[PDB]
Amino acid sequence: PMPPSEFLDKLMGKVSGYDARIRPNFKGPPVNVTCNIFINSFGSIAETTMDYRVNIFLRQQWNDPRLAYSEYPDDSLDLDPSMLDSIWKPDLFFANEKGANFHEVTTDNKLLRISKNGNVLYSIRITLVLACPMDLKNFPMDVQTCIMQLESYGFTMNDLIFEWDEKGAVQVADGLTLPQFILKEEKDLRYCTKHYNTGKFTCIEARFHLERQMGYYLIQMYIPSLLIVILSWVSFWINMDAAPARVGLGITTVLTMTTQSSGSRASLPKVSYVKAIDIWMAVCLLFVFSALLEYAAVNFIARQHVEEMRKLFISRAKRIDTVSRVAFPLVFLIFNIFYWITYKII
Amino acid sequence: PMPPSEFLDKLMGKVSGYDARIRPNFKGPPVNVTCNIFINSFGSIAETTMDYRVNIFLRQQWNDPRLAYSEYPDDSLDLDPSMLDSIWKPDLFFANEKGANFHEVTTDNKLLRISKNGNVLYSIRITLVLACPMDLKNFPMDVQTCIMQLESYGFTMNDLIFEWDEKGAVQVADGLTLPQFILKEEKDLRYCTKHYNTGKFTCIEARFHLERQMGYYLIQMYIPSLLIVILSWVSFWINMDAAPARVGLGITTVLTMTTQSSGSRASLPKVSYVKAIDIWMAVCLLFVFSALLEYAAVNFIARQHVEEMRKLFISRAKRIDTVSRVAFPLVFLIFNIFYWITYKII
Amino acid sequence: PMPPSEFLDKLMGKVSGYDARIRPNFKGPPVNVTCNIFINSFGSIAETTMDYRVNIFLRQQWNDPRLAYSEYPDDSLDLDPSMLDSIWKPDLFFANEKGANFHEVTTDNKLLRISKNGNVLYSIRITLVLACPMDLKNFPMDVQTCIMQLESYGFTMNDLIFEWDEKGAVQVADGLTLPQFILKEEKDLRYCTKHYNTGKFTCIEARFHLERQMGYYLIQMYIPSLLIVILSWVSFWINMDAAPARVGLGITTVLTMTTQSSGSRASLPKVSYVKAIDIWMAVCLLFVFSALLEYAAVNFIARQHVEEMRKLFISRAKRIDTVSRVAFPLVFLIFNIFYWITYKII
Amino acid sequence: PMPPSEFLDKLMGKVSGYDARIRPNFKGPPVNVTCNIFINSFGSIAETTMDYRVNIFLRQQWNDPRLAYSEYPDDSLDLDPSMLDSIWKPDLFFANEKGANFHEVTTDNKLLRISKNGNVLYSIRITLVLACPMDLKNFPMDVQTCIMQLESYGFTMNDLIFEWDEKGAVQVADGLTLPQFILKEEKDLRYCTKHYNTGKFTCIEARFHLERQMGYYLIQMYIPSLLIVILSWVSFWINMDAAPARVGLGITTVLTMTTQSSGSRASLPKVSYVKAIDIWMAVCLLFVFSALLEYAAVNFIARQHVEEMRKLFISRAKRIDTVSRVAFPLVFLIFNIFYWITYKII
Amino acid sequence: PMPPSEFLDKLMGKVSGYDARIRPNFKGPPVNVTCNIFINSFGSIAETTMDYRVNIFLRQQWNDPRLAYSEYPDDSLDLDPSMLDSIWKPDLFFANEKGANFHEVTTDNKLLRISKNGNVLYSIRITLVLACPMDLKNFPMDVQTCIMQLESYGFTMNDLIFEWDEKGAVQVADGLTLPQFILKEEKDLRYCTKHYNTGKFTCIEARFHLERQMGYYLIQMYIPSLLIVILSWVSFWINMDAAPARVGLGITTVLTMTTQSSGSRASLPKVSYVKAIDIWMAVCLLFVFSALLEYAAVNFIARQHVEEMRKLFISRAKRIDTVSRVAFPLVFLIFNIFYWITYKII
Ligand SMILES: *[C@@H]1O[C@H](CO)[C@@H](O[C@@H]2O[C@H](CO)[C@@H](O[C@@H]3O[C@H](CO)[C@@H](O)[C@H](O)[C@@H]3O)[C@H](O)[C@H]2NC(C)=O)[C@H](O)[C@H]1NC(C)=O
Ligand SMILES: *[C@@H]1O[C@H](CO)[C@@H](O[C@@H]2O[C@H](CO)[C@@H](O[C@@H]3O[C@H](CO)[C@@H](O)[C@H](O)[C@@H]3O)[C@H](O)[C@H]2NC(C)=O)[C@H](O)[C@H]1NC(C)=O
Ligand SMILES: *[C@@H]1O[C@H](CO)[C@@H](O[C@@H]2O[C@H](CO)[C@@H](O[C@@H]3O[C@H](CO)[C@@H](O)[C@H](O)[C@@H]3O)[C@H](O)[C@H]2NC(C)=O)[C@H](O)[C@H]1NC(C)=O
Ligand SMILES: *[C@@H]1O[C@H](CO)[C@@H](O[C@@H]2O[C@H](CO)[C@@H](O[C@@H]3O[C@H](CO)[C@@H](O)[C@H](O)[C@@H]3O)[C@H](O)[C@H]2NC(C)=O)[C@H](O)[C@H]1NC(C)=O
Ligand SMILES: *[C@@H]1O[C@H](CO)[C@@H](O[C@@H]2O[C@H](CO)[C@@H](O[C@@H]3O[C@H](CO)[C@@H](O)[C@H](O)[C@@H]3O)[C@H](O)[C@H]2NC(C)=O)[C@H](O)[C@H]1NC(C)=O
Structure with missing residues (x-):
């Protein structure tokens, strides 16, 4: 054919x-x-x-x-x-x-x-x-x-x-x-x-x-931000009332929390709203900023000066250094419960 | 057809x-x-x-x-x-x-x-x-x-x-x-x-x-520049006259204000004129540069030495540390009023 | 024709x-x-x-x-x-x-x-x-x-x-x-x-x-991460019990280990799993984070105060500074044996 | 037709x-x-x-x-x-x-x-x-x-x-x-x-x-390099002879002058010759490097030790701290005259 | 026609x-x-x-x-x-x-x-x-x-x-x-x-x-690496035996030598072999790492304590601070002779 x-x-x-x-x-x-x-x-x-x-x-x-x-x-x-x-x-x-x-x-x-x-x-x-x-x-x-x-x-x-x-x-x-x-x-x-x-x-x-x-941002974003929050909690054990070292431990953990916050949006669109990595890197910015703000409460109370009054402000300098030593792993861990359960219901 | x-x-x-x-x-x-x-x-x-x-x-x-x-x-x-x-x-x-x-x-x-x-x-x-x-x-x-x-x-x-x-x-x-x-x-x-x-x-x-x-630059540019201005105000509470820690708190808050100023124009055209993010990141550079310049006024006045003259320069070292503690949240907040009302009329 | x-x-x-x-x-x-x-x-x-x-x-x-x-x-x-x-x-x-x-x-x-x-x-x-x-x-x-x-x-x-x-x-x-x-x-x-x-x-x-x-990552990734682990081991020789300098040597070697960890994945895909450069830059992050955590054990034990009790906590401050001086080049070198032999069998 | x-x-x-x-x-x-x-x-x-x-x-x-x-x-x-x-x-x-x-x-x-x-x-x-x-x-x-x-x-x-x-x-x-x-x-x-x-x-x-x-480089390059040169001049007023803080003010102003020098040629061709931004960021690197070199002259002269000799080296420690306090705003300002008039004739 | x-x-x-x-x-x-x-x-x-x-x-x-x-x-x-x-x-x-x-x-x-x-x-x-x-x-x-x-x-x-x-x-x-x-x-x-x-x-x-x-890398790579090697040599003049400032001068000159080493290969192919800028930025990394290692030899020898033994370790603390003050501009300058004559014969 x-x-x-x-x-x-x-x-x-x-x-x-x-x-x-x-x-x-x-x-x-x-x-x-x-x-x-x-x-x-x-x-x-x-x-x-x-x-x-x-x-x-x-x-x-x-x-x-x-x-x-x-x-x-x-x-x-x-x-x-x-x-x-x-x-x-x-x-x-x-x-x-x-x-x-x-x-x-x-x-x-x-x-x-x-x-x-x-x-x-x-x-x-x-x-x-x-x-x-x-x-x-x-x-x-x-x-x-x-x-x-x-x-x-x-x-x-x-x-x-x-x-x-x-x-x-x-x-x-x-x-x-x-x-x-x-x-x-x-x-x-x-x-x-x-x-x-x-x-x-x-x-x-x-x-x-x-x-x-989620396994990538759980390595770069959330864990090195978790270590800096632990790093500010070193300052409660440093020199047992106050030091010039607790200032530099209160300065620096705000820096590489701010720089890491600016590096949490390196290759993202510039959206107007506030996102999940923006309410983790800013609340954990508040835990490392309140640690140096905790030292400004110690270094002003404990540096005040009868014979009774000497042991009354050091006892107000240990109570601020044994409540804040435990309350910050209480407020941070209840935020850790509140953050991830919110994003499992959603 | x-x-x-x-x-x-x-x-x-x-x-x-x-x-x-x-x-x-x-x-x-x-x-x-x-x-x-x-x-x-x-x-x-x-x-x-x-x-x-x-x-x-x-x-x-x-x-x-x-x-x-x-x-x-x-x-x-x-x-x-x-x-x-x-x-x-x-x-x-x-x-x-x-x-x-x-x-x-x-x-x-x-x-x-x-x-x-x-x-x-x-x-x-x-x-x-x-x-x-x-x-x-x-x-x-x-x-x-x-x-x-x-x-x-x-x-x-x-x-x-x-x-x-x-x-x-x-x-x-x-x-x-x-x-x-x-x-x-x-x-x-x-x-x-x-x-x-x-x-x-x-x-x-x-x-x-x-x-x-505006909701993006109100997260990356204006708020981490707002925290460094608060961070320099820690230095007025540190060790109540002077310290070597107030130097490092006066050095570092100029650094990550300068680095953040250079990072405020990372992906912008190189225009000749001066813009709104350039008069926020430079005036707040002046509030963190005057804080270390405040310490250079304390550490030179208070380190001068009759029996009357001992309490006359420490009283000129507390007045400079209780006026500047309140006047900087007065000059900065009146700039905060002047900055945003100017850019709402425009 | x-x-x-x-x-x-x-x-x-x-x-x-x-x-x-x-x-x-x-x-x-x-x-x-x-x-x-x-x-x-x-x-x-x-x-x-x-x-x-x-x-x-x-x-x-x-x-x-x-x-x-x-x-x-x-x-x-x-x-x-x-x-x-x-x-x-x-x-x-x-x-x-x-x-x-x-x-x-x-x-x-x-x-x-x-x-x-x-x-x-x-x-x-x-x-x-x-x-x-x-x-x-x-x-x-x-x-x-x-x-x-x-x-x-x-x-x-x-x-x-x-x-x-x-x-x-x-x-x-x-x-x-x-x-x-x-x-x-x-x-x-x-x-x-x-x-x-x-x-x-x-x-x-x-x-x-x-x-x-392998000869490139053995120059940029593994050797400058090796030097920072040695750099934290300087702190065991610094001022022989404790110092404010051992804090800044315990802060900074965590920073440029974290920044170098974030720079170990600069131009890589964002994979979910954990890779060989991620278990080197995080375990060596733990050796430089435990060095400042070692100082928090020294500065809390040694700063405690009869006539017998004075020499009992300094002897608990030298033993923590002569065991940890040798045990960290024992735990790190046995990790160095465990890391490379694992990736030669594979 | x-x-x-x-x-x-x-x-x-x-x-x-x-x-x-x-x-x-x-x-x-x-x-x-x-x-x-x-x-x-x-x-x-x-x-x-x-x-x-x-x-x-x-x-x-x-x-x-x-x-x-x-x-x-x-x-x-x-x-x-x-x-x-x-x-x-x-x-x-x-x-x-x-x-x-x-x-x-x-x-x-x-x-x-x-x-x-x-x-x-x-x-x-x-x-x-x-x-x-x-x-x-x-x-x-x-x-x-x-x-x-x-x-x-x-x-x-x-x-x-x-x-x-x-x-x-x-x-x-x-x-x-x-x-x-x-x-x-x-x-x-x-x-x-x-x-x-x-x-x-x-x-x-x-x-x-x-x-x-010129109005762009007069905001990013020349003014934040101008502030670091002023920042090294703080060290002449700090603690009036010597301090450990003047070291960290002499270290850091060399760092963010070197980093800012490396950031002055971020997006430029790699030309062999030396240009106008290369003789500003290197001469002002010399003013911040000589400030720590000024402290190495103070800390070696003033730390030397009859009853006459005690007041003879402190008077050689104030003269080096009242000549250098004024001569550096003399050598820098005569360079500022020499730099811009040269590039207006050209 | x-x-x-x-x-x-x-x-x-x-x-x-x-x-x-x-x-x-x-x-x-x-x-x-x-x-x-x-x-x-x-x-x-x-x-x-x-x-x-x-x-x-x-x-x-x-x-x-x-x-x-x-x-x-x-x-x-x-x-x-x-x-x-x-x-x-x-x-x-x-x-x-x-x-x-x-x-x-x-x-x-x-x-x-x-x-x-x-x-x-x-x-x-x-x-x-x-x-x-x-x-x-x-x-x-x-x-x-x-x-x-x-x-x-x-x-x-x-x-x-x-x-x-x-x-x-x-x-x-x-x-x-x-x-x-x-x-x-x-x-x-x-x-x-x-x-x-x-x-x-x-x-x-x-x-x-x-x-x-060669005139470009002789401005960005070799000269700011030359200044940091000079910057570590400040530490031999600082406080004449030991200081907490010599630690921070021994920490920081390793950082911006490591960061500058990582910035010496920013836009290069990832070759396996070791090149001329890799044996300059690593040998000069050794001169700034041995300076803090020099301080760990001073701070351990000089902090040891009869009436004869007091002046026997300070004399072992000056000899280590007057040999190393001159031997490091001897070992570095003979490397400077060995580096450039090798790359002129080639
Ligand atoms: C292109 O390649 C294919 C596969 O290599 C060739 O197909 C094969 O051709 C041979 C030759 O006829 C087939 O063998 C025949 O097998 C039958 C039983 O199936 C047997 O009765 C015949 O006496 C003969 O031996 C073979 O089966 C066949 N294979 C497949 C998978 O089709 C094909 O001939 C090639 N074409 C050219 C133009 O070379
Ligand atoms: C392509 O698809 C369309 C939609 O699936 C087909 O259109 C549909 O064609 C059927 C067959 O004629 C229509 O049903 C007729 O509905 C009328 C009442 O409207 C009823 O009186 C007739 O007895 C018949 O059942 C159906 O309405 C029509 N639907 C639409 C939305 O047009 C079309 O036939 C398909 N074309 C081909 C070539 O298959
Ligand atoms: C294009 O270029 C090629 C090579 O340059 C030319 O080929 C050459 O042509 C000459 C002229 O005939 C050859 O010489 C002859 O050699 C033989 C022995 O082989 C000798 O018996 C003859 O008396 C004559 O001298 C030469 O061998 C030949 N070379 C090669 C490598 O083929 C070719 O002629 C050129 N074409 C044109 C259009 O110019
Ligand atoms: C395309 O649009 C143009 C402009 O919209 C049209 O041109 C206009 O056409 C009208 C109709 O002829 C003109 O009006 C005439 O004006 C003269 C005085 O100039 C008057 O004596 C006539 O009795 C008539 O009213 C008008 O002037 C003219 N405008 C312009 C600017 O040329 C045009 O007609 C449109 N073309 C088509 C195919 O619709
Ligand atoms: C295109 O432009 C060219 C150059 O502008 C024109 O060429 C010029 O044409 C004139 C007119 O013939 C020439 O002048 C003649 O000069 C001779 C001496 O050389 C003199 O004996 C004649 O009486 C006449 O004046 C002129 O030399 C010539 N220049 C050049 C450089 O060739 C050309 O004519 C133009 N073409 C057209 C189509 O306009």
Whole structure:
């Protein structure tokens, strides 16, 4: 018989009247495109720009009655992408592209196959840099929902309807891990149908839930801030009433708590609200600032001067150095109970 | 009847004499293009480069009498962007482009429709990186007006006239938020008509007012600078006349006020003038520098030595340590009144 | 006779029926493409992005019976890449591209030659930025296996089969060195055959083992952390019972151990687990934190006060200053034995 | 009559013999192209790369006798840039391009008009990243002359001659300001005619003088270096002969003078010579290093020990503490006179 | 006579049989291409990536007997680059491209001219980012030889032979200076002929010797490290036996020697070996670490306690403070002799 590209040239080129500019089912029902993606790569989830780079295989399936061949014996006629500008294709785009490209190495990475009843599979490889707003109210313990939405640009709802398929509409690669987050297996598949003054346009989207990994900030942020709070508690044991060394232990633990507070937001967006790492690095700034403020209470009370009055202010200098020695591991530990149970209920 | 692209091929291609190089209403009135944009994304407003990245849907509407079909029954003939190089289009550009691109993922993201009387809607998706000059005289409390202006390049005022439409000429996406600024709902829509030695060229523009979010600099810049000013006031309570510890408390609070002053302009343009964060981080540098300068007044007066003269310089060492203990929370708090009321009237 | 391009124009163009869209051995056995690469450049192995940039010469060899010329006297007809869009080529791609490009300087850097029996060599120059997951559990002493895999996109296993050849399927350039790693000469050449809902697709890959160079982190990370642990041991010799100087030697060696701990992960991914440089910079943080905690045991015991009791607490102040003077070079050196022998067995 | 593009198609296309490959005035005088630019944007003047990004409207005017229409009634036939590859255009380039691009948003931003005698105006919008060598001998007080030069590539002096016009050959936009520099209104317009082994080629250029804004480095560099020099002068008033506090005031003001010296060249090229900020941050490093060296003269002389000899070394400890208290605001202020008057004569 | 492009159209297009796919001197001697470059710009020599960006005019000269016109009166027929895809051109590439581009501003920056005997000059402007391995064993005093090599891709030695010409095969622009290096005038011009399993391919290259400028690291690295070594020598004059101030002068000069050591490799590749700035910043780390280790010898010997024994340990506390006061400017200055004479012989 005929070779299939030449068999398909008479199905398209100038003898069958196939016009690649005019959609199937024209002057009738709209085209029902059913979509599913395959995430090869995921990640580089920046928060300064609030975006993430995904790498998908975008599969699209629609029906074209004009491509319904009826006397070739096989079931799937493929097509190399040189003659892929000769069929109708849906004008899908992404509402939050922020730059995206195809992949054109050794061949344009595209796929086409045409079934006997005109079912057209069409798979392209796309790298997207998708925008998602970061809600950083509880910053190391937040579940980010970053989405991607697939709209139509030139055709309204009575021309082209996007759907997800029901056979697992978002697949994910086999060992797809992330350095900072983990990807949850529940992916919401819902509609996002838009409206403009141009009209209404179809839209489908897929939410991706991105639970963080708390195990990094529990090494850089929370534990070296925990040691400086213990370091200020050395000053209650130093020289048993007062010293010039307790000043320098009260100065320095405020410095590398302030510098570490400024280093807790080194590569973050400049959000207006106050977040979970901002109410840990500022309350523990208060425990190391009150330790030198504790010494200013000792060095002013104990340096005051009958024969009875000598032992009355040193006894007010030991009680301030044996209550504050135990009350600071009481106020700090009850904050430690209040901080993490609040961010487990949330 | 005819399919619409084939119906439009005889309206354009070589049988109707439609030349895509020659504007409508030729040798007559100029073409009245009416424009409106739709901001999908906004932000990444850098100040080192003084620019911002917007993502718009640029809609244009003009009238073409040559496209006035009169016997097709519908009201809107669309066109896929393959045959969009076959009509006349206005040569709109942006006077402050600084790099811009189209969006060509899965289809060139363009729109066309032609009404019965020749009204042509034309919508393209553009990512712009628009230049705006930053007036940073009062830096965390400024209202930036960053603009975008839409000129004509090859055609003068007697050939092509840009207008905004009256039905909401700048729309904004639904939940369009910003990390650092907030976008005000009042957008000025005015003319910017240019003049060269080539002639005069039409221009329309849209001002965008960008009020900041003070809630970030009120966490990193103003509060850790507030604590160091309190930290120098510890030195008035330390050892009740003088100490070697009051030197190290007078040295160190100048260091991490100077280092924090140099860190208050880490990612800013190198402007010549003096700004609001520069008159807070330098006046509070003076409160922590005068505290060690207060100790140089104590340690020189009190270390001077009849039997009357012993109690005359210690009484000049307590008065300097009980006036300065209260006058510094008087001079600093009256600066705190003077600083923020000045930047609320402005 | 004929010039070879004109001799090949009648072998391809419209007189021989050679269709560049239809694979050889059609309706028969699949095409057996045999591949081998030549690594010109290698490196820029980033860990923030977890990728690496390679520069290869991708050679492909398949058989085309339609190109079997039989009366030209030579053995290898080449072809400049202008008429290289006129033959069939396999649609090889890389499953972890993350951006890649050709090289088109002074000529498209491509090669073609056609043997007498239709054997087609095809060599192109590609720059790849290949993704590989970093397993950083033992960070300066890990052997990274970063791969690259060569799939087919549009053709299944019954259409196109990739193979490596047996004559050294991965060559490497002559003096190809790396700044941070070294490349091992054993390269695994195995199959990675994929499966989708589209079907199954061929895949071959090549593992690259990248042993690090420990000699850099043995200069910046481990030795300046070794000196601060020695620096805290000065405090056992300072003023022979206690001093205000031993406080400042116990404060400061915790600071530049904490700051150096935060600088041990300056340009690394934010992984959740705990790595080899994280259990060196935190255990040696404990040796410099226990030195000031040793002084808090001295300054509280020795400052307590019959005539017998005066020499009983100073003898408990020398024993704590002659056991701890030797036990800390015992506990630290047995950790030094335990740390490096663990990472030589692994 | 005829529409003008169709009137110009018979002036160019295959009936008039107009060849777009062969210059006007051929086998005669060379083509006299007269140029003028319009700077829309200017800036991002980096010094690490030693370049600057300009955005110009490059206007070119030459004479083509083959385009001299003689029976159309108007005076200026324009042309949309689709048929702009059909006329002769000069092969102007920039000798210091370092990357440059056109602007192709919504239309290729080009202009053409043809007068009745064949005068051809041609305006394109270009973004350039032009290289200029930075002479940083006196770094905050230098006048940089960064140039741009417009050569011919394929045609020698007997084929194509570039000129500036006399009606303001370099215009500048209306409110074109800069963050770091200011642009002087005097722009030199001179020749730069090149010579190779290929021959000699025409060249015109325009110098741009870029005076800096001293008001930034007078806030970050010179004033916080001025305060540390005052901070070392506290040590002459501290404890009136000697102290352990004067050591820590002599140590620390060398540290944050050295760290501030290393931060005075954070984002600069690594030039070999010594610049104006390098002889301020090193001489003021000597005033804070001699202050601790002053204490080493006090603490060695005054700690030496008949009944006459007790008051003879303390009188050599007050004279060294009342000469050096006044001589350092004498040597530093005469350096302050010598530093700025030297950089006002230059 | 004929216009030259039309005179050259009959020399190339379909009447002379000139095939642009088939090299000159076919079935005979190979094509002898003679090359020479002209370096316009040079620099941005990064060491993290180990590459450098050059901007060349690549001239190529070969002989084509098919272009030997014999009845046109002139000597050099040029050609605008529109019809430059119509001649044979050599497939030169660079073996270490790492990304490169042409320059296509206002015209494709290309040149062609054809002499009467068929000599073809061909000059293109290229920006290269060429890879070179950095040998940083003696880092501020090394002579880097960074190369560039010009290979053939599709043609072997019996088809196409590259040569340098003898009339100055590498020219350099007039005032081509560098910020960090200087370019030596001796440039080696030698062969680099490659061999693969494809065959052997021609190659020519040009070594560029890049001597550094020592005058930058002699300001940031060596002199502020020289002052800290002098700063530790203050401690021998402080309080004449021992002090708590000599501890803080022995602590701090180890800190900002360690921090300055970590800042001596801020923007360098992470090489395994030990370099010249690594044996200066570590030996001078030993002079400031032995100064506090000198105090631990004083404070333990001098604090030991008959009537004879009182003056026997203070005399062992002055001898350790008058030998070490002079021996450290003896051991450091003999290292200063040993360090720089070693790196002048090399
Ligand atoms: C593409 O998908 C759309 C929506 O899934 C399909 O439209 C639906 O088509 C059915 C079949 O005719 C319609 O059912 C009809 O409903 C009318 C009452 O409205 C009833 O009188 C008829 O007997 C029949 O049951 C259905 O209303 C319609 N829905 C919408 C929202 O338009 C469309 O047919 C699909 N196209 C193709 C080619 O499969
Ligand atoms: C495009 O917009 C321009 C400006 O909006 C329109 O130009 C205006 O056209 C009107 C209609 O002819 C002109 O009014 C006339 O004014 C003259 C006096 O100048 C009067 O004698 C006539 O009876 C008539 O009322 C108006 O002057 C003119 N304005 C300008 C600035 O040119 C133009 O018509 C629009 N084009 C289309 C196709 O709608
Ligand atoms: C491309 O490579 C594939 C796999 O290497 C080749 O397929 C193999 O072809 C041989 C030759 O016919 C097959 O052997 C046959 O096996 C059947 C039993 O299945 C036996 O009855 C026959 O007598 C014969 O020995 C072999 O099964 C087949 N293997 C597979 C997996 O398909 C193919 O021939 C190669 N194509 C070319 C053009 O070289
Ligand atoms: C393009 O510009 C060049 C230079 O501005 C023009 O060349 C100049 O043309 C004039 C007019 O013929 C020449 O003057 C002649 O000088 C000779 C002596 O050399 C004298 O005998 C004649 O009577 C006449 O005055 C002039 O020398 C020549 N200059 C150069 C450097 O070539 C050229 O004409 C311009 N082309 C056009 C089309 O305007
Ligand atoms: C391109 O350059 C190559 C090498 O420079 C030229 O090849 C050389 O051509 C000469 C001229 O025929 C050869 O000399 C001959 O040597 C044989 C012995 O081998 C001798 O019997 C002859 O009498 C004659 O002297 C020379 O061997 C040959 N060298 C190589 C390496 O092939 C070639 O001719 C040049 N092509 C053109 C068009 O100039």
